[PDB]
Amino acid sequence: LAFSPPFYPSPWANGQGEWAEAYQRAVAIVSQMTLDEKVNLTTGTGWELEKCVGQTGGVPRLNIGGMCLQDSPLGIRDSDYNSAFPAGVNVAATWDKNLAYLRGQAMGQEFSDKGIDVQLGPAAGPLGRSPDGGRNWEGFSPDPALTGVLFAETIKGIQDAGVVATAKHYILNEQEHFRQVAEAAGYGFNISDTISSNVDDKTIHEMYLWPFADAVRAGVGAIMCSYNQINNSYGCQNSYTLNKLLKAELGFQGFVMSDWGAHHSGVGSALAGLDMSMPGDITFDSATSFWGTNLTIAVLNGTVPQWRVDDMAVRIMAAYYKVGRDRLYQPPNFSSWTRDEYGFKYFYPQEGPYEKVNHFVNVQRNHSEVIRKLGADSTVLLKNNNALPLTGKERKVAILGEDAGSNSYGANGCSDRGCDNGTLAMAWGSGTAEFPYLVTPEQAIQAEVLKHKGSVYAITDNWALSQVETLAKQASVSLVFVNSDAGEGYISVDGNEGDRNNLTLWKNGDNLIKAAANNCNNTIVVIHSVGPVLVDEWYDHPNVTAILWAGLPGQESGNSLADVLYGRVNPGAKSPFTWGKTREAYGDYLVRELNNGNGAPQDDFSEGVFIDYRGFDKRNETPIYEFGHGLSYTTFNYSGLHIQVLNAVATETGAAPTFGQVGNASDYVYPEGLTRISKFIYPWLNSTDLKASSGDPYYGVDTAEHVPEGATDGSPQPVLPAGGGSGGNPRLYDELIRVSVTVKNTGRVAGDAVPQLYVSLGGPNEPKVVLRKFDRLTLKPSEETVWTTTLTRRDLSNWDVAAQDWVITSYPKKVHVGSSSRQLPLHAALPKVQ
Amino acid sequence: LAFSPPFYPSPWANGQGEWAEAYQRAVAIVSQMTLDEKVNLTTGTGWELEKCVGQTGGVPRLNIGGMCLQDSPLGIRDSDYNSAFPAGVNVAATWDKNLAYLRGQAMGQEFSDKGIDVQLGPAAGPLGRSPDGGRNWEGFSPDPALTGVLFAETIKGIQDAGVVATAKHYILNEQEHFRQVAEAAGYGFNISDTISSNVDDKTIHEMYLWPFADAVRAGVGAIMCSYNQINNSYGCQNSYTLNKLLKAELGFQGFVMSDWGAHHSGVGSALAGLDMSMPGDITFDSATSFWGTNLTIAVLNGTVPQWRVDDMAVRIMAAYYKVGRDRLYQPPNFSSWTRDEYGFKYFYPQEGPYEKVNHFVNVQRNHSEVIRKLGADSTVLLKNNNALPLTGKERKVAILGEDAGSNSYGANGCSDRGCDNGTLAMAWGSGTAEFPYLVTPEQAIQAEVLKHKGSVYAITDNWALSQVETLAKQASVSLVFVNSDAGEGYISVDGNEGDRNNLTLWKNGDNLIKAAANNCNNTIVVIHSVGPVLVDEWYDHPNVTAILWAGLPGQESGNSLADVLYGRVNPGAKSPFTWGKTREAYGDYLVRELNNGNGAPQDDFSEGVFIDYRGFDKRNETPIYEFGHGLSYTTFNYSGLHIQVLNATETGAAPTFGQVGNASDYVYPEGLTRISKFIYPWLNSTDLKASSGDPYYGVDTAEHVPEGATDGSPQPVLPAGGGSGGNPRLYDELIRVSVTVKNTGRVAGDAVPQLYVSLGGPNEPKVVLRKFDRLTLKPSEETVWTTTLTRRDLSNWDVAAQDWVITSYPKKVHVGSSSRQLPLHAALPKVQ
């Protein structure tokens, strides 16, 4: 079975780069803390004990409030009077770094104004190994360059607004099936441990880790480690991914929190690089914790060195100061668990003072404008045979499909969005937010037609095909709406257990399209979905005149779409994934049956880097719509490619420090006047008897044997060749080549172009092309601009597993510029650089 | 069994009153016609043979295009690019003669522009005997005064726009069950003839006939006779209702057409006063007619006098010229039977030239404005505990109920609106039109909340009570939507065969309301429905803060409603029927089971005039919301009642116009291709018996022709006739009544003052409406409302005299804001 080699000790923070000041503040305050106060920072107080989906007790003596951590990557979860933004996948489809940053800033403002200190997002894991993976839509794209850049921009927007971002899920959580043992048991599968992603060192560097390097370099405060194992070591105690790749190689200076239920040991996780246990207990409301009391005990008995617990506290305070949270701090002014104004302070056991728990604070500002704009700018025009924009003069408009209409239970009427009813503007699970309202395509399109005194109707029952065909025969245009949904694995809709069982349109969508196209020669298809779907049955029908993919647009969905359909916005989005003729074309099958008896299912990533377009290109398959494809209401020309060569670090760490002092066990015993709330997790001991206060059946059992070599080594360490900076050795970001090309609007309408720069790194098992740069450029008709970008040393390297470093290989490299991964009219060889 | 006495001969037209010019023109043209041309004007060409739901073949030699007759009373049926107006009952709720007129005008203009010559509406029969009758919503109100005025105004609006209006259904078709033998058989009942409404003579005159007297007097060009029998004589051959009451007593100068399938004999119906057979065949596409060939033969063989068929033709032409149709004529530019651009010219057999059958003419103009305004002005505010108008600043708004949302089959996705899915804006049957779109209350209210940056959602599954209760707990205001639907008897929705099985809200509506009101202290209920529903389970719940009934508002439903909820329109509508505590409180039960063996079920109107509020008042019952009740966002005061007393006997002989020749002049013209199922006026040969094909031809003919039926001599003028809508002395103004009305609140809006009389006597209702108006007043403004009582208004029908008499019992007048809120009252002076 795959095996995860040890890497110890767990690197200590050092004030690297832009963390100098936050680190000095953190050391100064942690140096004042007792051991129990430090432990409080690292451990949540139990599921549903306080207001936020994760919450720590904070350090009241030093006026540090409990940290409130709240989902989701697209808007505040489980709250009120908040906005519901488009999903991460729509941000990918914009190809627009500025919109990514502005959506991060608008979310950070809302989370800040609710008294939330840490936003649980954004997401770049799953990256998107499989097109049917249940959570790809929360992240960005299966391409690491596109994802890393928009991931980083989103982080900077949230943290500039004063909230810590959490880069998740770290790492290789590429499918929902078998991700948690009790979830799997619920679905009838008996496994002893969760699915193991087994992946080689070059692929993890070149694909899945890459956006995390960009997140670290962009200054992300927190990372959330994942439910799956990696080579049979759980993501929240994997010393290789946490200590070696994230902390020593990427130089991460912030803190690592568990996913909820992803914490699986006290000592082992602390030594392997975990910094924060969420929601704090071992299982929800177990009234036990791997940390809390156990972690205080593990320091007192000598098993976890004081320097490791002090380092967890320093990384957590440093991230909090780095974004300035101390300057915006207020307790969370809502409850995740009830919308009542008043209630008991500690929700789950219904204890504590009875007081106000919701303040109904409206934090939306005018964030509907950026939502509406980002929905329009993420609507990919896949096909258009001179059918769009509509003019408003269409005499009779048929709006066809459940996906145009309202959810009959209300927009929020399925818990955690766990149904696919009405228009799909948000997929399901914890990566969700309550809509303040949802504008449906039916509403926005009917309103548009009425403003023009047209005739218009909506049919939203996709087995009402008699009515559909009769109306389509009468209509000037039939706008047909179809979807395909997915979400986190704890919810199953129609047997889809988070992951999609297929890539086919849900609710009879292929048959609805055929019924309309059979009868109307101007049938336009709009798809809302979490990822690609199969369009082969109808995309080339002679009466399917246009096809758009609008993703999961959030609360302004119908307006975003009407702006594009009626030409107020010229669509500039480009597909952030491949649209294949079949499911087999994408390869990368999910693991859906037990393949390791009743042990952890094994998920070998045997395709290596060959996911999405890299796989299609390697197998010489032709997508229907390739990665980077999107049409516009204007045309653009690329000309004049030029390349210019440009003229372009500690070897050991310090010893591990300690901050403040640890005293006797009696200093950490529960304080005499404190009422202990049922199920609440505390840092304190029942008595000075360590074994009895731990309640651990394995307390003191063969301890040395279970402490890996190097795990308590506080001496100076070697800096790895690929380490020593933020996101990797700083030499990786030297700029080696400047590339320029002229882009011109050759059409009659102002529009944005998304020029794309791919490289071919050369060599027998490298992808033919890999994206490296892009931008989104607004041009008036006939306007030209010179698009200039640079390739860094990292952009031209491959990961060399013998060197443990990035290397520019001797194969000749080329650059290619154009409008998609398959439309690259300009190509230049690159000169040898190093 | 009840018996319907004869009245013959059928009165001939005489250019009475405003008909003088149209009649001279009609006599001039009919005098040029051959007998087969006259018969073409009287007989439809067969079900689905041409474009319109009814169509005659016209007289092409004299450039008279076939007459196209089209439903419905609320917009053009079976067409495209037309509007869908609010139903008649919503016009009754406006209490607004001017809106009634303007809705008539806007409809007439659309029908005219499609090449439609005759609109099959408006309706005042059913009047509304039973609250669960399936078609009462097509007409106006169970009160004859209110219905008669708005019925007439609607007629005037249609006909001033150049379309003949058809006052229907004449008369006593007060329920759907048992109205047609073949429908009853489809619903599992075996009856030999249709339901018989049995009604005494005073009740018919004071209630059901009275709005048709107003329609006649208003100049209505056509009447459609009904499918029921009256005292066991079918409506479309009832000589007492057609010849005596409509033609001799009310003086009607226009034409009577059958309802579709209500024609039941050729000679019998022609002599008892029918003038037009629709859709022209005996059963649909039977290729046989009681008229057509048979009527040409009935004149040739002497059984039907030429004067009778000449008078049919004169009545039909005179109505056509009275509204000026000749100056607006064009063939119908759409097909009722297909939306395709091209098709065979004669749809049912797919014969004739293959050519354009639809022109897609968009006749809507700006008529969405009158529809939006009429919906707002027909929204009755029944209850308002200081909750309305909303301001737009409510932070979270819950829109609850299927009746707020979209029909998932599309607004026209149930044929003839035969389902209750989504918001109810039109009830079902042939009294319908295709919506050009339908603005739902979900759409309009969510749009209004988003304009103010509020939060808002709609729940539209009325069994999703978990979600309802959760959302109602979080909401500032919960707007709950509920409905009850009904329709013409050939469609059954959820086992309601036209008529309503009960008066309870459909789709879980009572439970929906209680789920919201249990959880939200500002729960406002909006009801869309064809008539009253029972509200006793929740109307006095302390968290139900306002209740509105919006009727069947047509295409602008959500916008009409948001204008009232949000205070752009101050509601002025008043209830045009009673809201009782139970179904029993209304009495007047439908006949739901066979009560005469397998013969015609018998429907005795044994309550006499005591329908709706007159029955509540006679039983001393207290309605929840009485007839004439409706609130406003301002208050009004009524004061200052002042009362002031104010200062032919034979017809001509029946004429004939033009000549009738030998049978051979009427045989099918040799070069004509006879279209399958098409009804023609011609004979196969000069052999009359063989050309008729009638198994009864020539047998016992005289014993089957009632006495007087061929008498063309001058006739006595009835004491109660001699004018239009009755003897002109009926309309002398006898008493003037004035009151002062003041707006004492802070919002401009309309008052609906109501004047009731008490005619006195042991058998008379305590109060009956006679006059009303809708008066617009700004805050603090006052006006004097002056009206008059006619001799008719103070009379009762005396069966011995066969005339209206003002009885000796002392009479009183009552003026106020509803049938139960009448603070002003006085004795009336004796007048005669």
Ligand SMILES: *[C@@H]1O[C@H](CO)[C@@H](O[C@@H]2O[C@H](CO)[C@@H](O[C@@H]3O[C@H](CO[C@H]4O[C@H](CO[C@H]5O[C@H](CO)[C@@H](O)[C@H](O)[C@@H]5O[C@H]5O[C@H](CO)[C@@H](O)[C@H](O)[C@@H]5O)[C@@H](O)[C@H](O[C@H]5O[C@H](CO)[C@@H](O)[C@H](O)[C@@H]5O[C@H]5O[C@H](CO)[C@@H](O)[C@H](O)[C@@H]5O)[C@@H]4O)[C@@H](O)[C@H](O[C@H]4O[C@H](CO)[C@@H](O)[C@H](O)[C@@H]4O[C@H]4O[C@H](CO)[C@@H](O)[C@H](O)[C@@H]4O)[C@@H]3O)[C@H](O)[C@H]2NC(C)=O)[C@H](O)[C@H]1NC(C)=O
């Ligand atoms: C001071 O106070 C402290 C706080 O109170 C006290 O702390 C207690 O110390 C105890 C030891 O004294 C701890 O108990 C022992 O824990 C270990 C670790 O278990 C966790 O990690 C497992 C994987 O371990 C590898 O990786 C981690 C880092 O991730 C390293 O830390 C490990 O050293 C180890 O490293 C090797 O492998 C990696 C690659 O994976 C390499 O890179 C390295 O180089 C090394 O080669 C993981 O598998 C465990 O998962 C189990 O438990 C989860 C829930 O906790 C559960 O979800 C999982 O499904 C799984 O459940 C199965 O096992 C558990 C018991 O562990 C059963 O209860 C359960 O029923 C299932 O069977 C976990 O996340 C654990 O390995 C030890 O148990 C082995 O050894 C004991 C005997 O010593 C055997 O009885 C056990 O069966 C078990 O045996 C397996 O391993 C043997 C070799 O180790 C092998 O010989 C056997 O054949 C067998 O298969 C102990 O349980 C305790 O966790 C800790 N408490 C707290 C609160 O932190 C401290 O004692 C006190 N100090 C003093 C001086 O008093």
Ligand SMILES: *[C@@H]1O[C@H](CO)[C@@H](O[C@@H]2O[C@H](CO)[C@@H](O[C@@H]3O[C@H](CO[C@H]4O[C@H](CO)[C@@H](O)[C@H](O)[C@@H]4O)[C@@H](O)[C@H](O[C@H]4O[C@H](CO)[C@@H](O)[C@H](O)[C@@H]4O[C@H]4O[C@H](CO)[C@@H](O)[C@H](O)[C@@H]4O[C@H]4O[C@H](CO)[C@@H](O)[C@H](O)[C@@H]4O)[C@@H]3O)[C@H](O)[C@H]2NC(C)=O)[C@H](O)[C@H]1NC(C)=O
């Ligand atoms: C009661 O109402 C009903 C319903 O409205 C009335 O019935 C309608 O009556 C119309 C007559 O008013 C009759 O019209 C015939 O339509 C025929 C079909 O027309 C369509 O197809 C043709 C041919 O492809 C197209 O050209 C045309 O535009 C239409 O699309 C026409 O073929 C008939 O035209 C003939 O008569 C008219 C005058 O009526 C002449 O102007 C015209 O030139 C045609 O004349 C030829 O045929 C006639 C028939 O006798 C001869 O008299 C004449 O001399 C010509 O003869 C030459 O041609 C014929 C064959 O072409 C050939 O055999 C011969 O040897 C010669 O060479 C006419 O227009 C409607 O069809 C009819 N509707 C239905 C459903 O039946 C009814 O009249 C009303 N009754 C009363 C008493 O008012």
Ligand SMILES: *[C@@H]1O[C@H](CO)[C@@H](O[C@@H]2O[C@H](CO)[C@@H](O[C@@H]3O[C@H](CO[C@H]4O[C@H](CO[C@H]5O[C@H](CO)[C@@H](O)[C@H](O)[C@@H]5O[C@H]5O[C@H](CO)[C@@H](O)[C@H](O)[C@@H]5O)[C@@H](O)[C@H](O)[C@@H]4O)[C@@H](O)[C@H](O[C@H]4O[C@H](CO)[C@@H](O)[C@H](O)[C@@H]4O)[C@@H]3O)[C@H](O)[C@H]2NC(C)=O)[C@H](O)[C@H]1NC(C)=O
């Ligand atoms: C007056 O005249 C009126 C008009 O003719 C008469 O009205 C009819 O009354 C009938 C008798 O009551 C009605 O027929 C009843 O209809 C009930 C509702 O059926 C509809 O809803 C259910 C429930 O839907 C929820 O569940 C579905 C899945 O279970 C789900 O898809 C749906 O979305 C809803 O979800 C919510 O609820 C679930 C939890 O349940 C949640 O999980 C979810 O989150 C949401 O919260 C549905 O199953 C059904 O298909 C239909 O869509 C049926 O429930 C009744 O059937 C029950 O009772 C029967 C006995 O009557 C029995 O056979 C059966 O086993 C059940 O126990 C029943 O059919 C009829 O609809 C009314 N018609 C109209 C037009 O309103 C009225 O009766 C007359 N009154 C008098 C006094 O004469």
Ligand SMILES: *[C@@H]1O[C@H](CO)[C@@H](O[C@@H]2O[C@H](CO)[C@@H](O[C@@H]3O[C@H](CO[C@H]4O[C@H](CO)[C@@H](O)[C@H](O)[C@@H]4O)[C@@H](O)[C@H](O[C@H]4O[C@H](CO)[C@@H](O)[C@H](O)[C@@H]4O[C@H]4O[C@H](CO)[C@@H](O)[C@H](O)[C@@H]4O)[C@@H]3O)[C@H](O)[C@H]2NC(C)=O)[C@H](O)[C@H]1NC(C)=O
């Ligand atoms: C790890 O993180 C956890 C979680 O944040 C944190 O636990 C919390 O510690 C705080 C600070 O110690 C605890 O605060 C206590 O709150 C109780 C209850 O306060 C509410 O209810 C009361 C009663 O209705 C209100 O009056 C009050 O305003 C609050 O609404 C307080 O009563 C405590 O303060 C008083 O009593 C304390 C007992 O805990 C006394 O010890 C204290 O000195 C105060 O004295 C006054 O009240 C006394 C009792 O009535 C009276 O005898 C005195 O004479 C005097 O009048 C205190 O503020 C909070 O409960 C903990 N939360 C939970 C869930 O247990 C850990 O401290 C943190 N650990 C570390 C090491 O940092």
Ligand SMILES: *[C@@H]1O[C@H](CO)[C@@H](O)[C@H](O)[C@H]1NC(C)=O
């Ligand atoms: C600690 O003390 C509490 C209260 O007596 C008890 O419920 C709990 O079980 C004890 N914890 C341990 C680990 O024994």
Ligand SMILES: *[C@@H]1O[C@H](CO)[C@@H](O)[C@H](O)[C@H]1NC(C)=O
């Ligand atoms: C008239 O002649 C037609 C055509 O021959 C024939 O079908 C029809 O039955 C005849 N009509 C009657 C009443 O005999």
